[PDB]
Amino acid sequence: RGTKTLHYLSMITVNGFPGIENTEKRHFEEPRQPLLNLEKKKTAKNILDEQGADAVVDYVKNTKEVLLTDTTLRDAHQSLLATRLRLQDMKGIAQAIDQGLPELFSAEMWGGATFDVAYRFLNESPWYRLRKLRKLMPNTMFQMLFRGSNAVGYQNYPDNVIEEFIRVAAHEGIDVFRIFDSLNWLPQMEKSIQAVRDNGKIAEATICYTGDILDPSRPKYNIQYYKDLAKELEATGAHILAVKDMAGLLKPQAAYRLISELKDTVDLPIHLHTHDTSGNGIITYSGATQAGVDIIDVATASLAGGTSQPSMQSIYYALEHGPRHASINVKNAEQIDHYWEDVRKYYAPFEAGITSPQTEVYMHEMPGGQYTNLKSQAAAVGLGHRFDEIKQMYRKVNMMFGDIIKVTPSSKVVGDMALFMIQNDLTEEDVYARGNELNFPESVVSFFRGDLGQPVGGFPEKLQKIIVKDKAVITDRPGLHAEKVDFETVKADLEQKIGYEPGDHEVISYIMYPQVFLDYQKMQREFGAVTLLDTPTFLHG
Amino acid sequence: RKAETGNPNQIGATMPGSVLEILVKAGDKVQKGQALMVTEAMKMETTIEAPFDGEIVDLHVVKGEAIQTQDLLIEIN
Numbered sequence: 001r002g003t004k005t006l007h008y009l010s011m012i013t014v015n016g017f018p019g020i021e022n023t024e025k026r027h028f029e030e031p032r033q034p035l036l037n038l039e040k041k042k043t044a045k046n047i048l049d050e051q052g053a054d055a056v057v058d059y060v061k062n063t064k065e066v067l068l069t070d071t072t073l074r075d076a077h078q079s080l081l082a083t084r085l086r087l088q089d090m091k092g093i094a095q096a097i098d099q100g101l102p103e104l105f106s107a108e109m110w111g112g113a114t115f116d117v118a119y120r121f122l123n124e125s126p127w128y129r130l131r132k133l134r135k136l137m138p139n140t141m142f143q144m145l146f147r148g149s150n151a152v153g154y155q156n157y158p159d160n161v162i163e164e165f166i167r168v169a170a171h172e173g174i175d176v177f178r179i180f181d182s183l184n185w186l187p188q189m190e191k192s193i194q195a196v197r198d199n200g201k202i203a204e205a206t207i208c209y210t211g212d213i214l215d216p217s218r219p220k221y222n223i224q225y226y227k228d229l230a231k232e233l234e235a236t237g238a239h240i241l242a243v244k245d246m247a248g249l250l251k252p253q254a255a256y257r258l259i260s261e262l263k264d265t266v267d268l269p270i271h272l273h274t275h276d277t278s279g280n281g282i283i284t285y286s287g288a289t290q291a292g293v294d295i296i297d298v299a300t301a302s303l304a305g306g307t308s309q310p311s312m313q314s315i316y317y318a319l320e321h322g323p324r325h326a327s328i329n330v331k332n333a334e335q336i337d338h339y340w341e342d343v344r345k346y347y348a349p350f351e352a353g354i355t356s357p358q359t360e361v362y363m364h365e366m367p368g369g370q371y372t373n374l375k376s377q378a379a380a381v382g383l384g385h386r387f388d389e390i391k392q393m394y395r396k397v398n399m400m401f402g403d404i405i406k407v408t409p410s411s412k413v414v415g416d417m418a419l420f421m422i423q424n425d426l427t428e429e430d431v432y433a434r435g436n437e438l439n440f441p442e443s444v445v446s447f448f449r450g451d452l453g454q455p456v457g458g459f460p461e462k463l464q465k466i467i468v469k470d471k472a473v474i475t476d477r478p479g480l481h482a483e484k485v486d487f488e489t490v491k492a493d494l495e496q497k498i499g500y501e502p503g504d505h506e507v508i509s510y511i512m513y514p515q516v517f518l519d520y521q522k523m524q525r526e527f528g529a530v531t532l533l534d535t536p537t538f539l540h541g
Numbered sequence: 542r543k544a545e546t547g548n549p550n551q552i553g554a555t556m557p558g559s560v561l562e563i564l565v566k567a568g569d570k571v572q573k574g575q576a577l578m579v580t581e582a583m584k585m586e587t588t589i590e591a592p593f594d595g596e597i598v599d600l601h602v603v604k605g606e607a608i609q610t611q612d613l614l615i616e617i618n
């Protein structure tokens with residue numbers, strides 16, 4: 001293990017870290033530890049552990065204050081630091097988060113891009129991160145982002161594989177599952193919601209928000225569509241209705257109107273998630289709080305704003321003398337934020353540089369988590385200086401696709417198509433004329449084949465026939481057309497490849513990301529557990 | 542080594558990356574709508590299909606080495 005550690009240190013010292021400039025390792029002082037005034041309170045995690053998920057729902061319904069979900073550990077660093085936040089810093093502050101802020105409804109620390117990114121770039125197992133954080137935070141409810149039938153991947157998976165992931169993740173410590181479909185299709189969500197209910201955890205059925213409900217010129221996603229979707233999601237027995245504003249498109253007037261209309265539609269508590277990209281995130285949460293939203297998603301101030309969540313410390317003072325307060329220890333949250341400000345300086349190579357709010361997001365509707373990666377993807381392909389060009393193409397491709405809901409994995413499809421169009425200098429009537437000779441990206445082809453489900457209003461018929469030439473097109477759930485994976489045969493071949501008997505979490509990781517998990521195991525054999533190094537040593541040797 | 546733009550014989554990639562595996566041998570039959578080679582990005586796959594009905598004469602890239610945007614992958618006659 002010392003040999004592997006010295007091997008990694010020498011490799012990074014000599015050849016640099018992949019994907020960043022081989023800069024000098026700056027001397028960092030130790031991050032500031034919080035000084036906390038601890039109050040022993042009963043949390044929602046305790047209610048779930050003792051009385052169950054329905055009692056957590058009743059406790060949320062009986063809370064007059066708005067509850068807070070901390071997205072610092074997943075979404076804040078996904079939006080700002082390209083998901084590169086390492087378990088070392090999280091474990092530096094995890095106990096202080098669990099004790100100093102027991103008023104949090106949950107902490108979003110898993111799922112989304114973290115599962116892919118930890119394995120691929122950080123060379124640490126997300127299951128290991130979940131275990132370490134679960135040990136460090138026993139009284140904090142753990143929330144994960146689950147992309148329905150797409151799981152933590154970008155493609156459809158069979159239903160038994162989804163159920164196995166939900167079982168293993170619930171056993172490992174995930175308590176709240178935020179389940180969403182990229183195209184807001186209920187059949188993609190039903191099996192995941194049922195599996196979460198069967199595992200005794202909290203199922204959050206999510207409505208992805210797009211467009212403007214207060215704009216009469218855009219009637220595709222109006223208020224009646226969202227109300228019907230909410231009623232259908234309430235029929236599935238999900239515990240909490242979630243509303244994902246992934247690009248920060250929910251205006252505060254719309255936020256009041258949408259939440260109030262959802263409250264008289266369904267009896268579920270409403271969990272609102274938005275990004276502060278337009279700069280209106282705080283006033284959107286204020287509008288939803290006046291409308292009676294139950295839980296909102298906030299981040300610590302040093303990792304908030306921009307494409308990330310609205311600030312947890314800011315939302316306290318925004319609601320400080322209103323009818324509803326935010327349920328948080330604001331003095332403990334400010335002390336915890338001192339740590340997060342210090343460790344953010346470690347991730348300077350991954351800084352987006354997004355210094356200003358953009359109201360242009362109301363036009364292109366790029367999700368906050370996709371803002372950095374789509375720009376970095378243009379840099380790798382050589383059009384990174386043309387980001388505003390691909391942002392305009394992102395608007396056009398969404399219109400060509402039929403004004404779809406853009407969120408992972410559907411936003412990746414629009415991002416890949418927009419990058420492919422600019423790289424080849426294509427335009428809208430050009431793909432309609434020359435698309436037969438053109439070779440579209442695999443994500444675009446699979447999306448029009450139906451791998452991501454059926455969009456609202458269906459695909460455009462002419463564009464679909466151009467994009468998929470002779471491949472089979474399905475009109476139903478892609479999970480019905482996925483072969484059931486036998487976990488015994490997968491465990492046998494994985495043991496042969498990695499040299500030891502894998503766990504249930506390791507078998508599931510091999511099904512989610514076969515090449516990525518195998519590449520992670522090879523680096524583990526070469527460099528060992530590099531997650532134990534601090535971030536400047538991990539990044540600069 | 543630059544693939545000519547305009548004539549669909551000289552096909553190429555779209556994004557820089559690495560060709561993983563070349564399913565087709567050198568200079569054999571190709572049917573319209575058949576995967577020949579995979580191109581790559583950091584997190585984006587592309588199985589380039591057959592532009593028409595034809596056959597290769599010579600192959601330009603091998604297993605695993607880096608490729609560029611527009612670079613010559615297969616010239617298929």
Ligand SMILES: *C(=O)CCCC[C@@H]1SC[C@@H]2NC(=O)N[C@@H]21
Pocket residue numbers: 112113116117367369370373407408409410411412413583584
């Ligand atoms: C790999 O480069 C990191 C993840 C890239 C995809 C992520 S997942 C969440 C964001 N949404 C999206 O469509 N792409 C982003």
Ligand SMILES: O=C([O-])CC(=O)C(=O)O
Pocket residue numbers: 078111112113145147246247367368369370407408409
């Ligand atoms: O990027 C988004 O808006 C959705 C997201 O976080 C994910 O599913 O990984």
Ligand SMILES: [Mg+2]
Pocket residue numbers: 060061062063064065066293294
């Ligand atoms: Mg309440």
Ligand SMILES: [Mn+2]
Pocket residue numbers: 075246273274275368369
């Ligand atoms: Mn988000």
